[PDB]
Design a protein around this ligand. Structure first.
Ligand SMILES: *SC[C@H](NC(=O)Cc1ccc2c(c1)OCO2)C(=O)NCc1ccncc1
Ligand SMILES: *SC[C@H](NC(=O)Cc1ccc2c(c1)OCO2)C(=O)NCc1ccncc1
Ligand SMILES: Nc1ncnc2c1ncn2[C@@H]1O[C@H](COP(=O)(O)O)[C@@H](O)[C@H]1O
Ligand SMILES: Nc1ncnc2c1ncn2[C@@H]1O[C@H](COP(=O)(O)O)[C@@H](O)[C@H]1O
Ligand SMILES: [Mg+2]
Ligand SMILES: [Mg+2]
Lengths: 277, 277
């Protein structure tokens, strides 16, 4: 397979054209194990800049048929630059391996934070939703839809700032296709999986999970969860305040066009009453 | 911008390593114009084999932001090998142009055949639907969905058989994403635009257009066409027979999961009574 991506492979001077080489990095402890290779804490040798190096094995990527997914993830993420989006500085590859040079987020995942605290107060929740909506507003200005927002894909920086990670399901949103609607089925004309409103629903699920400690459609079988999502059937515990209910209910709409714009989330009075941000 | 695709660029002995070059081809008359270049009749010089050379301009592709769409089109189509799918033998590129080396379809488009005849008899129609269903069964076996089937995209081979062309909107649709439904909106769970059933609707529209000479949701505004498609509002002129009505009505279902399998189209009693294949 071709590992020539439309993504940077140029060496970066982190203190302030040569391409990356494995010899540029002092490889330290494993940070995590992925399906195709691990993530290591690493340092670029010249600058001593601390980063995360994700090592993936080409043989394994091709056997699984996920190499074009990796290509798209790298091409998308490496062109996003925002303080609440995990940076992908570049990539390179050698005879057997692909290497992703990533921002190191030192304080783990929001998934872990929720495990530890069970639920978040309204200030932490509103701050995190502010950070996510800012990150997603930036994505949508680049016509990028993330499509896999959930707590294990939210990493924490050293000041506790949220970092959206995992662009493996993202797409670059918007011809002769639509010039002629006559031959298109309803689902091609609507194009809902390519609508930026996908990510607004996930923001509502997160806001609920942050406050309650479980997501609103949780069930012990897939079929019951899908049923409740389809009916938008969920309930609030008594302790969820009316302002929080208003925002969450606005976001969890089956019809994506009824969901709010991200600016309306950022400007919601419950968010501005409670955010540190 | 990278023009390294996971698609063949090796020289082929059409009578029966070295990469393609423009000087391998004699160029003939222009076959057609597109917004990004032109298509020419061409001939590979050693074998004298007739083909089509589609020439696209890099500057126009990159300005329009469609270069990754072309990459996907070439990657998908060059790995499909079926007598009712237009072959893409390989590609190459130079400082300004991308070249696609295509099978030449000498009898033109089904679109032009409809202009000439107005409408098709049942035997011609059923034979075309069999060829199309065969091609789509092969595609779906390769986990490819075409998503833009329409008469302009159906070319005609030397024996008058259909050749599906234009894979510009196609997707290869073979997982942590669905591991948890809890954070996915309904449109991501359902994934309708990634369902192979997309192409069964268009088969129904085509069957109608072939018999009637107008597509079933035709309207004089796009908004009205969309409303008719969304509402599945269509009717038949009186000459359309009961068997054809049954097939078309079975294909044009709003819910993709209610559309038939391709085997049911190929074995439909109207199809087998009328198809020469
Ligand atoms: S074709 C009409 C058009 N819809 C889209 O562009 C959605 C779409 C389709 C195909 C894609 C894609 C996105 O990305 C990949 O391939 C449109 O006009 N949409 C707006 C609209 C929707 C519903 N009603 C009216 C207007
Ligand atoms: S996540 C459930 C799964 N749906 C999909 O895989 C659709 C999909 C999602 C994301 C994509 C994609 C396709 O292609 C590109 O990214 C599924 O099991 N669907 C079938 C199903 C739906 C509803 N209930 C039961 C089964
Ligand atoms: N850039 C990073 N900084 C810190 N930890 C990470 C980084 N990327 C991945 N991880 C962690 O390593 C584990 C495996 O990563 P992945 O294979 O990318 O899912 C995950 O649980 C992450 O929490
Ligand atoms: N492989 C081919 N064989 C014959 N005609 C073609 C071929 N490819 C494209 N054409 C014609 O050239 C015109 C423009 O092609 P396109 O740019 O693919 O839309 C269309 O009218 C097609 O009829
Ligand atoms: Mg590749
Ligand atoms: Mg490219």
């Amino acid at each position: 397979m071709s590992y020539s991506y439309d993504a940077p492979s140029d060496f970066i001077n982190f203190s302030s054209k040569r391409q990356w080489a494995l010899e540029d990095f002092e490889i330290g402890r494993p940070l995590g194990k992925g399906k195709f290779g691990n993530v290591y804490l690493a340092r670029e040798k010249q600058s001593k800049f601390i980063l995360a190096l994700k090592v993936l094995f080409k043989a394994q990527l091709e056997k699984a048929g996920v190499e074009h997914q990796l290509r798209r993830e790298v091409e998308i993420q490496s062109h996003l630059r925002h303080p609440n989006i995990l940076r992908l500085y570049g990539y390179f590859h050698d005879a057997t391996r692909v290497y992703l040079i990533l921002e190191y987020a030192p304080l783990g995942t929001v998934y872990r934070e929720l495990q530890k605290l069970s639920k978040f107060d309204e200030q932490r929740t509103a701050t995190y939703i502010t950070e996510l909506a800012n990150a997603l507003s930036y994505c949508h200005s680049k016509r990028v839809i993330h499509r896999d927002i959930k707590p294990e894909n939210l990493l924490l920086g050293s000041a506790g700032e949220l970092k959206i990670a995992d662009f493996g399901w993202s797409v670059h949103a918007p011809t002769t296709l639509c010039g002629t609607l006559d031959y298109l089925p309803p689902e091609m004309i609507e194009g809902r999986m390519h609508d930026e409103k996908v990510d607004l629903w996930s923001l509502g699920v997160l806001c609920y999970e942050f406050l309650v400690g479980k997501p609103p459609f949780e069930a012990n079988t897939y079929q019951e969860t899908y049923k409740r999502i389809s009916r938008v059937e969920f309930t609030f515990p008594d302790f969820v305040t009316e302002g929080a209910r208003d925002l969450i209910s606005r976001l969890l709409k089956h019809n994506p066009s009824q969901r709010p714009m991200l600016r309306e989330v950022l400007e919601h009075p419950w968010i501005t009453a409670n955010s540190s941000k």
